[PDB]
């Protein structure tokens, strides 16, 4: 009977962060029900329904001119915005009759290793609340921050390496910096890399896998240059 709107909040993370997983303490600022009210608006069993407005501070007047119009009239006698309550001092003080107040709570969202971009982590019922509404959810969406060396593809890592024509034709070492602080030396044999479209594939060197474990591959691409 009236669901409250969700609060969507995306959380960025570097590829290296989604590599080892991360935990973030988040501060949630939201509208909550009056504590010294319990949402009532007044003292237990005090507030009284608006007789002049069987619900909200709303009344309908029908004036004429050319045609007849139904002009919605607000302030219902002893109400409006609050079609009820009344009684000078049976009302909060901590909510002055507005039935709601601010609350700052902390949530710890755990970004598990291998979490894909756009991934959702749902916090049931933590959204804003108002008297009558079923509070919605606080939805975090993992956003993959841009990277200066890798591109992600599912559970792999794509890396464009710039190699010399000489290395490519004679073969030799070659190294890159994995999302995990570890440095990685790669060896290639003569000619292996020069073909158009060539891709080198290195076993479990590319990102943690959500359901299960292990890792995807590290797919390498080559850009070959030769001076002068």
């Amino acid at each position: 009977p009236q669901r409250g709107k969700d609060i969507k909040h995306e959380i960025s993370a570097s590829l290296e962060e989604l590599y080892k997983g991360r935990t973030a303490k988040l501060a949630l600022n939201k509208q909550i029900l009056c504590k010294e009210c319990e949402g009532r608006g007044g003292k237990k069993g005090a507030v009284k329904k608006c007789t002049s407005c069987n619900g909200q501070g709303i009344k309908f007047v029908t004036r004429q001119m050319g045609p007849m119009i139904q002009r919605f009239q607000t302030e219902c006698d002893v109400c409006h915005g609050t079609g009820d309550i009344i009684d000078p001092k049976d009302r909060c003080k901590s909510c002055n009759g507005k039935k709601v107040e601010n609350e700052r709570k902390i949530l710890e969202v755990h970004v598990e290793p291998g979490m894909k971009d756009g991934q959702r982590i749902v916090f049931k019922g933590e959204a804003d609340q108002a008297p009558d509404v079923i509070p919605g959810d606080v939805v975090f969406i993992v956003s993959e921050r841009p990277h200066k060396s890798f591109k992600r593809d599912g559970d792999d890592l794509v890396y464009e390496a710039e190699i010399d024509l000489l290395t490519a034709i004679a073969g030799g070492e070659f190294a890159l910096e994995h999302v995990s602080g570890d440095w990685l030396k790669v060896g290639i044999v003569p000619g292996e890399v020069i073909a158009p479209g060539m891709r080198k594939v290195i076993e479990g060197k590319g990102m943690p896998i959500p359901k299960y474990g292990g890792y995807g591959n590290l797919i390498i691409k080559f850009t070959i240059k030769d001076p002068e």
């Binding site: 609060i7 303490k25 988040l26 600022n29 939201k30 509208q31 959204a127």
Partner: peptide
């Protein structure tokens, strides 16, 4: 409702 990271 709105949020921010602590620390």
């Amino acid at each position: 409702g709105w949020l921010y990271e602590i620390s």
